[PDB]
Amino acid sequence: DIQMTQSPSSLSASVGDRVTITCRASQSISSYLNWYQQKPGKAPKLLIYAASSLQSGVPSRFSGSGSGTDFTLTISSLQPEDFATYYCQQSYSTLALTFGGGTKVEIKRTVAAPSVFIFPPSDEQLKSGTASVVCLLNNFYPREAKVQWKVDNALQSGNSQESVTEQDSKDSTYSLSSTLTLSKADYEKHKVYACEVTHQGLSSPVTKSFNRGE
Amino acid sequence: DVVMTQSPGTLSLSPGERATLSCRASQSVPSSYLAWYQQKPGQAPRLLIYGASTRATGIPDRFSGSGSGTDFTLTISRLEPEDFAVYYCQHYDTSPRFGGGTKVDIKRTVAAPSVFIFPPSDEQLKSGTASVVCLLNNFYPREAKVQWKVDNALQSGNSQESVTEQDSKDSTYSLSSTLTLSKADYEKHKVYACEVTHQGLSSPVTKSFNRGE
Amino acid sequence: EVQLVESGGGVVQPGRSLRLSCAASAFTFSSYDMHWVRQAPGKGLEWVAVISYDGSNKYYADSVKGRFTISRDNSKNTLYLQMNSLRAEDTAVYYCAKDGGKLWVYYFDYWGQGTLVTVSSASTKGPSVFPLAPSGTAALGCLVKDYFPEPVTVSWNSGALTSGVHTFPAVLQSSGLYSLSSVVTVPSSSLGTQTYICNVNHKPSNTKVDKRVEP
Amino acid sequence: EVQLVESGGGLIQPGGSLRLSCAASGLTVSSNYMSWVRQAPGKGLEWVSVIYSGGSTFYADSVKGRFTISRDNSKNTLYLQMNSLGAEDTAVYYCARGEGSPGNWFDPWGQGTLVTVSSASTKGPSVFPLAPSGTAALGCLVKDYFPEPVTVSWNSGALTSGVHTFPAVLQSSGLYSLSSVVTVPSSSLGTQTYICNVNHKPSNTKVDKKVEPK
Amino acid sequence: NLCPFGEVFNATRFASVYAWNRKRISNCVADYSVLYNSASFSTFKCYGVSPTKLNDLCFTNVYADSFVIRGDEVRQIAPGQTGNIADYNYKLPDDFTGCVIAWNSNNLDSKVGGNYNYLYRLFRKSNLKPFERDISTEIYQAGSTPCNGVKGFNCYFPLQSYGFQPTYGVGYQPYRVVVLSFELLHAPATVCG
Ligand SMILES: *[C@@H]1O[C@H](CO)[C@@H](O)[C@H](O)[C@H]1NC(C)=O
Known about the structure:
Oligomer: heteropentamer
Strand content of chain A: over 45%
Domain BetaCoV S1-CTD (chain E): 1-193
Structural class of chain A: mainly beta
Protein name (chain E): Spike protein S1
Helix content of chain E: under 10%
Bound molecules: 2-acetamido-2-deoxy-beta-D-glucopyranose
Shape of chain E: globular
Region (Receptor-binding motif) (chain E): 104-175
Region (Disordered) (chain E): 122-157
Largest sheet of chain E: 5 strands, antiparallel
Distance between the termini of chain E: 12 Å
Region (Receptor-binding domain (RBD)) (chain E): 1-193
Order of helices and strands of chain A: EEEEEEEEEEEEHEEEEHEE
Order of helices and strands of chain E: HEEHEEEHEHEEEEEE
Number of domains of chain E: 2
């Protein structure tokens, strides 16, 4: 089977930068190499077919070249909405079509400080039996951001789970939501519920907290 | 992608007896793809039989192979001491595959060992180390107990043993135990002895020497 | 202006069957080859099968051969994928793809939106929607909890409230169920005057609901 | 007069490289199937690689990407370049004509050459006599060498009856030590000279020891 | 009238791989859809062209090569492959444009006592060029001394037999292969789909 190897697996470049992606084939595939773009949660879109032909409707900042076993995809001027995962795919072995592993392209930008917001569990949730404290980090860069739970100034781990939104197509900022799930019997046992945030855009850790029933 | 398995692992037969070696395959293999190799200790493997049954050039008539499909057999008629070796079956599918081999041990009557003891050479003593060597020569079976006694004190933790393969001519084993000391520790003692117990010995055998004499 | 509309995804126990469909529009369907391509969650893309323009020649990847079946109705402009003897490894989003006719070889010039197929012996459930109340702008949101499996689509005002909305990827809590959050930041001025209601839909269980979010 | 003479074995550090040689006489290397088979200490036979007469090469998965087989027609020599060697590569390596298929079996074989992959250092042996007192015993002690092997002959090959060369033991110092003994009639001690010929191939240490009674 | 693909696929007897048959197909209409939906193929791979696009394409000539090999040897009938079959019997170019079709033929080409009619080349000084056929039976010289047509030590008959028996494993069972090559020259086409 014809293996397609892409490099790099991931890269970060700022808006306006030139970006080139490399795809290598385990054997000569002539010129039958195709490039696909996949936004998060969206179906792939054809960009380049047969190594270097532009698909209709695709912007002109995309181009391709290569023959044999080495092929490149080039974005001449990166735009914010170009954040996606880029795949190559060989069509020389037409009954054993194979894709590459993909290259995830991320938008590099200036540091953005997160806006931290904490939410106590609703009264409709305590009526059910569970209790979830949700903390929100809004519009920051880079993605790397530490979220630490404190309940009565006691560190919490093993009761929550984070979730990050994919990079925004407008301002290229991320967003994080941590859900501190715990039972109702454990909820009234304690008082303080804090949410500490460590980020590159913060000169000192920022903490948003609240008092239970206050 | 066909796995072959040899059986048994080891085989112990008296000379003149008939040896049956098996090579089982998970899938039906053509006979012409199977071969047998002999490897005597410290030697390279020798082609015995190829194509399941064709005897290689210069191989004695007593070696013969048969079988097909999932069961191939190597037979050594009139087993001889020199036949002591490991036997591997081999085949090709997408690549050469070897079996795990089968060791063929040769049984014989019990033989008492001949015990010898060697003092360290004066050449070695000048280096600051003394090696006392006890030799158990041409015994059977392999089980043997060697005890070092220095000034009639049983020694533990300063000797190593080594046993040879079964002799290709008489099917016996040999053994050497080396008691290792510093020159300083060696000069502190007079009587050096190794005591040997073996099945062929009614009573244990002791071989000793006095340092200096 | 080529469209490929898919349907048929859902939940299925291992060993059971499922049939996906893909309805094509605005091109000469009966003279193009059609493909099926899948993508396991978090993984890459895998080509599944191809069917000739007339539907006589069919070719499958080894990982689905003798187990899946591709077919088409040219009078209905619809592509099909029959999935029998489903294993857990078949869990993926399945895409139909029109073949581009500019090369001697295959390639996927237009893709369908994809439908999720989840092979699991677990049951399908409905979401609980607990509101996240606000307390220099504010933030309010809805919490979708305890549903299986993926996914759930969440919108605000039947698709009328667009800007400011953030829907987060789900998290598989220890209970095996999924939990999902969706927030939206509004100015602190219009809190007791503007109404905020989120829309939730769970196709695997065929359940929808609405919920208002007050401070 | 067909022979396969191997060379190039010895000590190599982990991650180092090594090239084996297989000088042939009685056959044409460039015209034959030529294979490499290795045997780990105490274990079985494993095929490593082969070169077809037409030039195509093939490698077992355990060595793919680290070994490179080659030949030199003018020198009629087979070669095996082994790179990134680890502990599992320590074995006796044989060259053989053929590939083990019908009409193409492994025949003949070379004597083999031992490759030791360890962080230690090559150490030459010390040779000491084992002096005798119906039949007597004498011998040689080959002590403190690394790595294996040493080969011991007696009277340059003219003395084979009753000779026992023992397997090496690994002392607590990390160096090996073996002994070679021969049993003779007690009456020939004064009227026969006994020389053991020690050869520690990894260091070109060839030592002859005359063993006389004390 | 239609191109005679049935004369190749439905042939009662196939060639040995070393003496592989080739049929030059010209001046006819090729019906690939009925060709590919006839028998049940254990192997169907195409290169540089889709099986379903062949109905639209025209070619100067089309070649149908047919032979029999082992089950485990089918993998060598592809661009960029090496091995005893690809090197010394039947070789495809790295830029091959065509299709490789193979199906198990145990019920046809295996005998109870073994079918030794099918052979392959084992020894050769050099590899074949793409689409080259070598039917030489000269004694192979593996040593310095000349053979002079006498098979003995270092002097081997170059061909080996398969000996198909119907009870073998599929890796050792006979497989009939058809390779469709598409010759596109700067000349008027004689074959259209
Ligand atoms: C071979 O014969 C069968 C009938 O036995 C027929 O259906 C098929 O089309 C033939 N194959 C070709 C390539 O003509």
